[PDB]
Amino acid sequence: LYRRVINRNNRLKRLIDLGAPEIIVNNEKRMLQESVDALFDNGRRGRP
Amino acid sequence: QIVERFGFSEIMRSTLEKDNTVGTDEALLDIYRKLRPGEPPTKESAQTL
Amino acid sequence: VDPAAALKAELRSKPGDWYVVHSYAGYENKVKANLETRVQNLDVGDYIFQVEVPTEEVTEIKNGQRKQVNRKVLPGYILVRMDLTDDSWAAVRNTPGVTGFVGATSRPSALALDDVVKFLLPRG
Amino acid sequence: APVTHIWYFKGVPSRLGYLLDLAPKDLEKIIYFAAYVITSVDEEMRHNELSTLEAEMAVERKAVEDQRDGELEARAQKLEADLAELEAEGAKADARRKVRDGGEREMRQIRDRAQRELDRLEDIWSTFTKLAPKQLIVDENLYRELVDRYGEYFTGAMGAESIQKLIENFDIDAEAESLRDVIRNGKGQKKLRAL
DNA sequence: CGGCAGTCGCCGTGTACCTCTCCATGAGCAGCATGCGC
DNA sequence: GCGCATGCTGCTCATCAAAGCTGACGGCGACTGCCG
RNA sequence: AAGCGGAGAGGUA
Numbered sequence: 348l349y350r351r352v353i354n355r356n357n358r359l360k361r362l363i364d365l366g367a368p369e370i371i372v373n374n375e376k377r378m379l380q381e382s383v384d385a386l387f388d389n390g391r392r393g394r395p
Numbered sequence: 396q397i398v399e400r401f402g403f404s405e406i407m408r409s410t411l412e413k414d415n416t417v418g419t420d421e422a423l424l425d426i427y428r429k430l431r432p433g434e435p436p437t438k439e440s441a442q443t444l
Numbered sequence: 445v446d447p448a449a450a451l452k453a454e455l456r457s458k459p460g461d462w463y464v465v466h467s468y469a470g471y472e473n474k475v476k477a478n479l480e481t482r483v484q485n486l487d488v489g490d491y492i493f494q495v496e497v498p499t500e501e502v503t504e505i506k507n508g509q510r511k512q513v514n515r516k517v518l519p520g521y522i523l524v525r526m527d528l529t530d531d532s533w534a535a536v537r538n539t540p541g542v543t544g545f546v547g548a549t550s551r552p553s554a555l556a557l558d559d560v561v562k563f564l565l566p567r568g
Numbered sequence: 569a570p571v572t573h574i575w576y577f578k579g580v581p582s583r584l585g586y587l588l589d590l591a592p593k594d595l596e597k598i599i600y601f602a603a604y605v606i607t608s609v610d611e612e613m614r615h616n617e618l619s620t621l622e623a624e625m626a627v628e629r630k631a632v633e634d635q636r637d638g639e640l641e642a643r644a645q646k647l648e649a650d651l652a653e654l655e656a657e658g659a660k661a662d663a664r665r666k667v668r669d670g671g672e673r674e675m676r677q678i679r680d681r682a683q684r685e686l687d688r689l690e691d692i693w694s695t696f697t698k699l700a701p702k703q704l705i706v707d708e709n710l711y712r713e714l715v716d717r718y719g720e721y722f723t724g725a726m727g728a729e730s731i732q733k734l735i736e737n738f739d740i741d742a743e744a745e746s747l748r749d750v751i752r753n754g755k756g757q758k759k760l761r762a763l
Numbered sequence: 764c765g766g767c768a769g770t771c772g773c774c775g776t777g778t779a780c781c782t783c784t785c786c787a788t789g790a791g792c793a794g795c796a797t798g799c800g801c
Numbered sequence: 802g803c804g805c806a807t808g809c810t811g812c813t814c815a816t817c818a819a820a821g822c823t824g825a826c827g828g829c830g831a832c833t834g835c836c837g
Numbered sequence: 838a839a840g841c842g843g844a845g846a847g848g849u850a
C-alpha cells in the first residue's frame with residue numbers, strides 16, 4: 348500500500364512538472380486520493 | 396393477449412391498470428436503461444441485450 | 445517560419461476533434477492496434493481517423509552509458525481524432541483495454557489545439 | 569496535492585458535512601472531481617456594478633435580436649421571391665406551396681435559435697445574480713462561461729484544496745451562535761439538526 | 764412546505780489445545796548455440 | 802573453416818480490474834426521494 | 838550468532 352502511494356505520488360509530480368493539460372493532472376489527483384483512502388481504511392468506499 | 400390468456404385473476408387487472416407503458420419498444424428501452432446504467436439506450440442494443 | 449505554427453495550421457485544417465482515452469501501462473500500442481482493427485472491421489472510418497501515442501527519446505543511463513530510449517510523455521493515455529457520435533462513442537468505449545473517455549465531470553472533453561501541438565512536435 | 573482523511577468524511581455521521589453544512593453526496597462529488605464549488609464571492613463589487621452588467625447583457629440581447637430580425641427579413645424576401653417566381657401560376661403553385669411552408673419553417677427555426685441563445689444568456693445572468701458560497705455547479709459550459717466573461721468578483725475550485733479553502737474561510741463563533749439561537753426559539757426537525 | 768415511510772448500511776455473534784498442505788504470472792528483453800552459406 | 806543469422810532460454814518487471822458470484826440475520830439510525 | 842508471516846482442511850474437552 349505504501350508502494351502504490353509513493354508510485355502514484357511520483358507519477359503525479361512528474362506529470363505536473365511537465366505542464367500537462369489540467370484534465371490529466373486532475374485524473375492523477377483523483378487516483379492519488381483513492382490510493383491514500385485505500386491505505387488508511389480499505390473497503391470503506393468502492394472495491395477493496 | 397394478456398387478457399386473452401391471464402383473464403381469470405384480479406391482481407393481473409390491478410397490475411395492468413397501473414402500467415402506463417403500453418409499448419414493446421418502450422418496454423425494451425426501459426429494461427435496457429434499468430439494467431445497464433450509463434449508456435445510450437439504442438433500440439438495437441435494447442432488443443439484443 | 446515556426447514549425448509549431450505549421451503543425452498548428454495543419455491540425456486546424458484537419459477534420460474532427462481530439463480526445464484522450466485512459467489505458468493500461470504497457471498496452472498503449474496494443475490498444476492502438478485494437479482500435480485500428482475494430483474500426484476497420486466495422487467500417488466506421490468516417491468517425492475515427494487517427495491514433496497516436498506520443499513518445500520522446502530520453503537518455504537512459506545504463507551505468508553511465510547514455511542511450512536514447514523511447515519514453516511515453518503521458519503514460520497510460522492515448523489520443524484519438526474523431527467526431528463524438530453514439531456509435532463511435534460506444535465502439536471506442538467497448539474496445540478491449542480502453543478504460544474510458546477522460547473528461548471533466550462526466551462527459552468527455554476535447555483538448556485545445558495548443559496542447560496537442562505542444563505534445564506532438566519532435567523533441568526527443 | 570492535498571488529500572482528505574477517510575475517517576472524517578465517510579463515517580456516519582459525516583463529521584466533515586456537519587461542519588460545513590453540506591450533504592454527503594455533494595462532498596462525494598466535490599472531492600472525487602465531479603463538480604465545481606464556489607469557494608468565495610464578493611458582494612460589494614457586484615452590488616456597485618450591477619447596472620453596467622445589466623446594460624452590457626441588454627446590449628448583447630439587442631444585437632442578437634437585431635441580427636435575427638435581419639435574417640428573418642432575408643427569409644421573408646426569399647419567400648416573396650419564390651411566390652413571385654413560380655407560385656403565382658396555378659400549375660406550379662401547389663408545388664411551390666411546399667417551398668413556402670419550408671421557408672416559414674426556416675423562419676421558425678431562426679426564431680428557435682434566437683430564443684435558445686437568449687435563454688442561454690439569461691440563464692447565465694440569473695446564475696450570476698444568485699451566487700453564494702458552497703454552491704454546486706455541475707455542467708462545465710456554464711462555469712467556463714462565468715469564469716471567462718465575469719471571472720472577476722468570484723472564485724471557484726474543484727477537489728480537496730477547495731475543501732481546504734472552505735475550511736479556511738469558516739468562522740466557528742458565528743455559526744455556533746446561530747445554532748444556539750435556533751436552539752433557543754424553534755421546534756421540529758430543525759431543532760434535531762441544530763443539536 | 765411538510766411529513767413520511769421505506770431502505771440501506773454498519774455493528775456484533777464463547778474459551779484453551781493438537782496434526783497436515785500450499786504461497787503470481789505472462790510476456791518482453793537480451794544471451795547465447797547451432798546451422799548454413801561463401 | 803570462419804562469419805552471419807535465427808531460434809531455446811535465462812533474467813526481469815508490473816499493479817486499473819471485473820468477470821465472476823448466488824445458502825445469515827437482528828438492532829439502530831441517517832437519509833432520501835416521494836407523496837400530499 | 839540465528840529464524841519463526843498469511844490461507845485452507847481435519848480433530849480433542
Ligand SMILES: Nc1ccn([C@@H]2O[C@H](COP(=O)(O)CP(=O)(O)OP(=O)(O)O)[C@@H](O)[C@H]2O)c(=O)n1
Nearest residue numbers: 775776777778779780781782846847848849850
Ligand atoms: N463445544 C464445547 C464442548 C465441551 N466443552 C467443555 O467440555 C465439557 C463437556 O462436557 P460433556 O457434555 O462432554 C459431559 P458433562 O458436561 O460433564 O455432563 P455429564 O457428566 O452428566 O455427562 C463442558 O464442561 C464444557 O466446559 C466446551 O467448553 N465447548
